[PDB]
């Protein structure tokens, strides 16, 4: 039910499995060998992306689960200028 | 409740539903263009909007403003949008 994401800089992120299945690459990572079917952690070690981009993509996962199709006054997503051009690569790598 | 049935009346998400001049729907032609069949003016039928969220046919709004500059529903001055 809960999946674990580890950033390259040691930082861990835990979010709902439904929240992290909105990205195709993470869905592939959970599938396949080493699924670690303990149903509690399913940890994945992102060896490249830093901590802040992983925090931002977890925020995005929750943001898309909450507002997938509802509340047509959709809130804007606060991309910082410094975190941009690095979250784009992360989103591409995760196929969000 | 083990099982339940219902009916759902679906209609298009347009905020306006009827043109209260000819009392017709907006999807089909206005009475101005229903008279001379297809011809050439049937293709236009531009749905003019109003500042008071009042949407009617172009022909209906044209003849209405020819009569008076009052909204057909409320005593509001007509304006385009």
């Amino acid at each position: 039910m809960y999946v674990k994401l580890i950033s390259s800089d040691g930082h861990e992120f835990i979010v709902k499995r439904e929240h992290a299945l909105t990205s195709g690459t993470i869905k592939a990572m959970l599938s396949g060998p080493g699924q670690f079917a303990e149903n509690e952690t399913n940890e994945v070690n992102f060896r490249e992306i830093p901590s802040h981009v992983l925090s931002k993509v977890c925020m995005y996962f929750t943001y898309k689960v909450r507002y997938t199709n509802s509340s047509t006054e959709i809130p804007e997503f606060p991309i910082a200028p410094e975190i941009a051009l690095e979250l784009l690569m992360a989103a591409n790598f995760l196929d969000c | 409740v083990k099982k339940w049935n219902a009916v759902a009346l679906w209609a298009w998400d347009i905020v306006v539903d009827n043109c209260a001049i000819c009392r017709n729907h907006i999807m089909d032609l206005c009475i101005e263009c229903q008279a001379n069949q297809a011809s050439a003016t049937s293709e236009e039928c531009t749905v003019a909007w109003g500042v008071c969220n009042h949407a009617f046919h172009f022909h209906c709004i044209s003849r209405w403003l020819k009569t008076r500059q009052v909204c057909p529903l409320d005593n509001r001055e007509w304006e385009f949008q």
Binding site: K64, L85, L87 | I14, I26, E43
Partner: protein, 156 residues
């Protein structure tokens, strides 16, 4: 299919999909006004089913979606507009790409009906938001991103 896979273009970069999409496509004054009225959702559905490049852009940079949201008769033939927007989104056209003037199709919707329909059919993604924010912040993206994503920054 044979005609699409040569990609014909008019003077203003209009691909063959765009002319079926556009309302400004000239129609002969004779009986062709009665039958072939553009835009026509049947033509767009057939062309996308025959493999038209739905992401193709003209000289001005407008996509098929950019042209179709600029339709000035959203309700007189609302079924046509709804069917063509559904077909365009289902084909894989980006609902977020930008023309040469850097305008969202929602920003170029110029109509409440088209805006509502496209927002209903917009399928948001993190990549789209990130690329749009990068373009708005005007960060130097060349030689710092994947080359396939360089195109993504190009149209988003």
């Amino acid at each position: 299919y044979n005609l699409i896979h040569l990609d014909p273009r008019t003077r203003e970069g209009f691909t063959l999909l765009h002319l079926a999409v556009n309302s400004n496509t000239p129609v002969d004054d004779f009986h062709t006004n009665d039958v072939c009225s553009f835009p026509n959702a049947l033509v767009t559905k057939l062309l996308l089913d025959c493999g038209a490049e739905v992401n193709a852009v003209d000289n001005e940079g407008n996509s098929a979606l950019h042209i179709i949201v600029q339709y000035n008769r959203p309700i007189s033939d609302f079924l046509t507009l709804h069917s063509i927007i559904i077909s365009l989104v289902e084909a894989g056209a980006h609902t977020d790409m930008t023309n040469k003037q850097n305008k969202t199709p929602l920003d170029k919707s110029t109509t409440g009906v088209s805006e509502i329909l496209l927002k209903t059919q917009m399928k948001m993604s993190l990549k789209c938001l990130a690329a749009r924010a990068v373009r708005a912040n005007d960060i130097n993206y060349q030689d710092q991103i994947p080359r396939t994503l360089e195109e993504f920054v190009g149209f988003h």
